[model samples]
Target chain A: KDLNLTDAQKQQIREIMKGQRDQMKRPPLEERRAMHDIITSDTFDKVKAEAQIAKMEEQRKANMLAHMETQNKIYNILTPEQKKQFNANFE
Target chain B: KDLNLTDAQKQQIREIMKGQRDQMKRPPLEERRAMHDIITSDTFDKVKAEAQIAKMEEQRKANMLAHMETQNKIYNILTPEQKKQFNANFE
Candidate 1:
């Protein structure tokens, strides 16, 4: 359904999105490319690759937490009636 | 590095993927559209909307469980060495 957010809710979401814009920056494309190179190369070093992958996973978890925080904030902003509307789409 | 899966591992993954394909189907787009219409329309009914949402959530949970089960199966098939390689990418 159309979200039908109140003006205040819209504003809150805008702010949250702005905050998330910075938090969601992923590892450099080059890092992923390097991962692919390491995977495909004959001289793959498992230890080094594991370290890089762990770093990437940690960043991913952080990004997910940020998104969940934003979602919770938006959820809290909803009135009980509005929350019922939200649960219909997202729960 | 490349997943470097052996032939058997590749076959196991293929089976897992096939099982997952059936489970990943989502609620119909029309149902989602109907939900949107209810949310945005002047005649919003909270009870009806909530019932619809609850049904959708149940389906979503089932779908997620199916995916996780498939992933666990694939994870189990990995040899210790292969699992170490997997942990690098997915853990």
Candidate 2:
């Protein structure tokens, strides 16, 4: 709606989104299913539950890093004028 | 495909998803645009950029916690057998 991207630029962003989307996705179902396993175990494995949540935390960091990187890549591709316009939208 | 959800359970998960989806969305455009401002600045303000990223990391934590809670909520609604099957899928 603000600055228009060139077709090539659009494709670049699309590639970034497509490639990075998987990493950026929150592992809700995958993480929860594991927690379900941990809690329902006959033994209340506190360590295992902590480990599972810790794994999820690691996943979050990876996702966010990917997000930051994606932003950087998108920023790089912007026309200088487009970048200025995009920046102003936030100001 | 393994364990079937009753209509009520499906509705419940749908509500949970709808309510929590906002927290889980990746802010690529929003975040990138902000970084565009920071990096394109007259001065490369390290502090502001750090602050922006710190805020993003905090966002990651909130999103992941919501995911954990979602798992808990979904786990609570599962029939005992469904829960068992959901758990076993990971093993």
Candidate 3:
């Protein structure tokens, strides 16, 4: 990689990547099906589905924030020359 | 950033990105809690949760595949020089 990360830098990024991966759980499914069932049911409860969606959005935002922060954290690990080399691609 | 894509190229990428976003639904949530309550009840339904997780894994695989495909699709939209510029980050 143009970053030419040192051995230590590589390990640091590896750990960060691993942590990010660990946080990525296969999302819960029973709740997903329940929403489908609710919609299909004669007595569909919109509020229930709406509440579930509310929480789900919160989860999405948190996950997105974590990902962005981790990306920045990894960027901080680069050396001066490596950072410049990395930025060259964005020119 | 150095890709210097033309106006049409920008529109193409924008369309692709918008399509991807459209496909992203707020994940279903009701079925999720069903599993949690099922686990806490007098008779824990391990198989139920297990089956749900099985489908969950399949969904994850499909999503991951779609993501990789879309990334490659976007990358392919680049010009020869733009591709070279993109690859500079991996030098």
Candidate 4:
């Protein structure tokens, strides 16, 4: 469990999960249904699908930038030992 | 209402709504809680938060492309009547 988890990161994950749980519980069935209906409706679906497509295209153009950000985050907390393990695992 | 909707689109909307309702009902609370835990776990949270921040940073570079795609979608979908009405309302 602690194999790949830093103490600080573990704490952050707990907060994130707690927030997600509270949000999921906050909406009643009917309200969630209505919101879901709106999102999946043909009009909304078209918009969302188009938005997602656009997002993907955007992701492609900024791939290097995105990759660097991910690399930076990994570097900040991953121990030297963990980095070595990661490279070995990936390789 | 039929105000800005076509018969075909309305039909699509019905199916979307039905699918949404079914999915909403299918998930039990406990299952959702478990998933929330996985996403929010300390390691997962750090990974997800960093990913999100990276995505946002990349978004700035692709803003123009994203905007154009969105605008094109809107222009292609709405009828002249609907577009005029939408523009009027926004204005």
Candidate 5:
């Protein structure tokens, strides 16, 4: 069974999720499709592929950072008792 | 700082993470790259693109389910107090 969450906690979680969704910035599907085209075509362009890969990596880092921050914020809202109870689940 | 884990707990966590890593099944990079080519190429084959997308989606679901199961297994090892603390991080 899941732990009971208060309405306030639920609301906060929802807000955090919305913020996370808003912050995400992945390489566009269309752009990725184009990059795929460059890689598989008869003529391979190393320069173009590398540049696109670099851009994607940069975006991935930003998204990962944002997600970590959101996790920290969510954790901060718990009481000391709750925090203790929760952290036991992690190594 | 991260939570201080006992040697035994750290070992367990390491094992769980290893299992998780092993269970993950993403579409091969080459296969995905090929799929991208089909989608972006001038000659767009709807049937081929859909089939590849379907296969990828199936693999994605399998990976996601495996991840969720691993999380649950990790959670189950925690003490009641720790469980409360950890779940507080989620909605």
Candidate 6:
């Protein structure tokens, strides 16, 4: 179902995506490539690399939480029982 | 890349799914409904429900691990560096 896509909600999400895209555009490509090479180097330890991968995954999860927080804000407008049913259905 | 699934791999997954389906078939409709109600009852505490959901998710992860274990077994035949590269690319 489509949510309450009020102008404020639309603006909030747009700003979030804009900031994310701006960050993506400004990353040092050469430095990133060098870091990638180091991580994938022949002498790289698998255990250490996996730990780094897990840390990267947690960062991704944080970005997902930003979106979830917006959803929860909308859900808060719902009745208490409706909110509970909503989580149960989707979880 | 597609995995190297031998006949034994196929047989094991078939058995695993068959057992899952069989267990599903053995449940009574009423019992299932009752269990659902018991868990989702109005009086249910959110924290408790979340814990139960996490436990259910652990079972789902266990099933996924079974499949991953088979993949890792095949990966074991590769050199340690190749395995590290594979995980880095995909994980």
Best by lDDT: 2
Candidate 4 per-residue lDDT over residues A1-24, each given as its tens digit: 344676787766455445334433
Give one digit per residue, the lDDT tens place, for model 4 in B35-89.
3333333344345434444444443434433443334444445566665564444
**Candidate 4 Cα RMSD (Å):** 14.5
Local distance difference test scores for all models: 0.61, 0.67, 0.56, 0.44, 0.56, 0.45
Per-residue lDDT tens digits of candidate 6, residues A62-88?
Answer: 443343333444454455655465556
Q: Give the CA lDDT, 0 to 100, for residue A6 in model 1.
A: 79
TM-score for chain A of every candidate model? 0.70, 0.65, 0.62, 0.37, 0.69, 0.36
> Mind giving the per-residue lDDT tens digits that candidate 6 earns over B4-47?
45667566655655644443324345544443544334443334
Per-residue lDDT for A43 in model 3? 40
DockQ of each: 0.05, 0.14, 0.02, 0.04, 0.02, 0.07
Ranking of all candidate structures by their TM-score, best first: 2, 1, 5, 3, 6, 4
Model 3 C-alpha lDDT per residue in residues B1-91, reported as the tens digit of each score: 5567789978887887676756644344654554344433333344454454544443444453344445555676776677665656544
Q: Given the true complex, what DockQ would model 4 score?
A: 0.04
* Candidate 5 chain B: worst-modelled 10 consecutive residues by lDDT: B35-44
Q: Candidate 3's error at B58, in angstroms? A: 29
* Poorly placed runs, candidate 4 (over 4 Å): A1-3, A10-73, A84-91, B1-4, B7-74, B84-91
Q: Regarding lDDT, does 3 or 4 come out ahead?
A: 3
Residue-wise C-alpha lDDT for candidate 5, range A7-70, written one tens digit per residue: 8987897798688858897568766665444533343444555455545554655564465456
Best by DockQ: 2
Q: Per model, how much of the real contact set is kept?
A: 0.00, 0.04, 0.00, 0.00, 0.00, 0.00
Best by TM-score: 2
- Model 3 DockQ reads 0.02
TM-score of each: 0.44, 0.48, 0.38, 0.25, 0.42, 0.33
TM-score of 6: 0.33
lDDT of 1 at B18: 92
Q: Give the worst 10-residue stretch by lDDT in candidate 4 chain B.
A: B33-42
Measured on C-alpha atoms, candidate 3 has an lDDT of 0.56
